[PDB]
C-alpha cells in the first residue's frame, strides 16, 4: 500500500537553456529514476534518461528560451508483490 | 505418498504464513524487509529445536519430522525473496544496505539456530 | 485474499516437493556442501531472477501467477533454514572451511542465478 | 544409502591399561562418535565416551591388563532426513 511514485517534483534553479529539478524518494526500493520532459504543446519529441535511485535531483539541457516544457519523473522500483516495476508518474510544466 | 502428504501440509503453512507476513510488513523497512527476515529467523528458531528435540526423540514418526523441517520451516523460510532484495539493492546503488541484508540474514538465521538447538539442550538437562 | 491464497498454496506445494525430492537423492552425494539444497536455491534464484525482468515487461499479469511462480513456487522451492543446519551442523563439527565455503556459494551463487536470469531475459527482450 | 556407521574399526596401539584405536569416517557429517567399551565377560559396566567429529583415532584408558573387552563406536551425525541421529554400532574385541 506503499506508494511507489516521488514527490514534490519542481523546478529548483533554471537558466534559459537548462533546469535543475529536484524530487522527494517514494517510501521503495527505488533502482533508477527516469525522467521525460518535452515541450507542453504536444508538438515536440518526448526525452527520457535515468538517474540512480540514489540521486534524487536532476539536469536538463539543450531546452529552447521562453518555452513550455512538461517534465515528469517515475520510479523503477522494488516491491515484494510486484517485483521490479514502473511507477505512475509525478509531472510538472515549467516555462523558460 | 504419506511422506508426500507431510511436505505438502507443511509446505503449504509454511508458504501461507510467509506470504501474510512479507504483504504486510516488507514495505515498512524496504532497506532491508522485515518480513522476508523473521521468516528465516522464525525458520532457523524451528530447525534449531527441531534439530535438538528430535535428538532425543528417535521414534517420533518421521511424518513429524518431515512435516515440521522440510514442510513447515522449508516453506516458511526463503532464499529467492532474500536475493531479489539484495540484488535490487545492488542495482540501486544501495551498497551498504545489500552488505548488512547478507549479514543480518545469515549470522541471523544461524544464531536463530543455535539458540532453538541449546535451549532444548539445556531445558533437558 | 482467498484466490490470492491458492496461488501460494499450489505453487509453494509444487516448489516444496521439488525441494524434497531433490534433496533426499542428492544431499548424501557431497556432503561437506549438499548439492540437492544448493541447487533449489540455484534454481529458484534463476526463477525470481527470470521473473524479475520478465513481470517488468508485462506488467498487466493477473496477480495470481505473479503470486504462484514467486511467493508460491520459488519461495516453497528455496530454503534458508536447511541452509542453515547444513552449516551448523558443520559448525559443531569442526569443519569451519565447508561451513564458510558454504554460506559465500549459497549467497553468491543465488545473486549470480538471479543476475542470469534477469540478463537473459533482459538481452533477449 | 549412503551409511553413517564407521568401518574398519582397529586397536592400532595397545598398552597393558590402555587402547588406541582408530577408524574410516562415514561419507556423512559427523559431530562426534560415541566410543563405548566394556568387560566383555558378562556383566561390568559398559562406559562411554564421545570423540569430536574431526578425529578419526581415540584412546582408552583405566583398564585391567589382560581382560577382554568389547569397543563399539557409532557417530552422533547430520542427514538431510534425519537431522541428528545416531547410527548403528561397529564393535570389535581386543584383549591387553
Ligand atoms: C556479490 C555479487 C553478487 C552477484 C552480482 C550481482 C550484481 C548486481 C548489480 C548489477 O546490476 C548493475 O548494477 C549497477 C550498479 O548498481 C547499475 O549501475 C547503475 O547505477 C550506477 C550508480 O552509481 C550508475 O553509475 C550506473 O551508470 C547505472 O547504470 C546497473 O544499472 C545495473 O545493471
Ligand atoms: C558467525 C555466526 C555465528 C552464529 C552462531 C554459531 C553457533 C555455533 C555453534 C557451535 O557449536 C559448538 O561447536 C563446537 C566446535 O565445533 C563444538 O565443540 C566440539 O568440537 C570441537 C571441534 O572438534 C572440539 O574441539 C570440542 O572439544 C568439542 O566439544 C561444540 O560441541 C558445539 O556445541
Ligand atoms: C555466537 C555463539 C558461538 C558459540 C556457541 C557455543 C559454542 C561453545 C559451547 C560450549 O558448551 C559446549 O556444550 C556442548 C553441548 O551442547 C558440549 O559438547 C559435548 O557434548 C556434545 C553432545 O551433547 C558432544 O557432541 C561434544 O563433542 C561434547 O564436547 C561441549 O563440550 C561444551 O563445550
Ligand atoms: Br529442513
Ligand atoms: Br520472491
Ligand atoms: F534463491
Ligand atoms: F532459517
Ligand atoms: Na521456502
Redesign the pocket.
Same mark, same amino acid.
Given at each position: 500500500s506503499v506508494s511507489s511514485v516521488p514527490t514534490k517534483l519542481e523546478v529548483v534553479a533554471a537558466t534559459p537553456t537548462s533546469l535543475l529539478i529536484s524530487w522527494d524518494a517514494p517510501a521503495v526500493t527505488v533502482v533508477h529514476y527516469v525522467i521525460t520532459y518535452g515541450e507542453t504543446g504536444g508538438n515536440s519529441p518526448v526525452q527520457e534518461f535515468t538517474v540512480p535511485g540514489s540521486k534524487s535531483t536532476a539536469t536538463i539541457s539543450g531546452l529552447k528560451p521562453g518555452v513550455d516544457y512538461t517534465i515528469t519523473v517515475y520510479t523503477m522500483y522494488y516491491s515484494y508483490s510486484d517485483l521490479y516495476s514502473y511507477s505512475s508518474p509525478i509531472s510538472i510544466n515549467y516555462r523558460t | 505418498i504419506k511422506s508426500l502428504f507431510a511436505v505438502i501440509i507443511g509446505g503449504s503453512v509454511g508458504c501461507t504464513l510467509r506470504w501474510l507476513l512479507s504483504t504486510k510488513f516488507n514495505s515498512l523497512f524496504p532497506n532491508l524487509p522485515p518480513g522476508t527476515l523473521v521468516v528465516n529467523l522464525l525458520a532457523g528458531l524451528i530447525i534449531g529445536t527441531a534439530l535438538a528435540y528430535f535428538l532425543r526423540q528417535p521414534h517420533l514418526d518421521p511424518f513429524w519430522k518431515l512435516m515440521i523441517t522440510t514442510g513447515l520451516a522449508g516453506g516458511l523460510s526463503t532464499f529467492c525473496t532474500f536475493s531479489v532484495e539484495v540484488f535490487a539493492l545492488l542495482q540501486a546503488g544501495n551498497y551498504i544496505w545489500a552488505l548488512t541484508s547478507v549479514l543480518v540474514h545469515? /549470522?541471523g538465521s544461524? /544464531?536463530m539456530?543455535?539458540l532453538g538447538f541449546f535451549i532444548i539442550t539445556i531445558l533437558f538437562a
Open positions: - | 545469515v /549470522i544461524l /544464531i539456530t543455535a
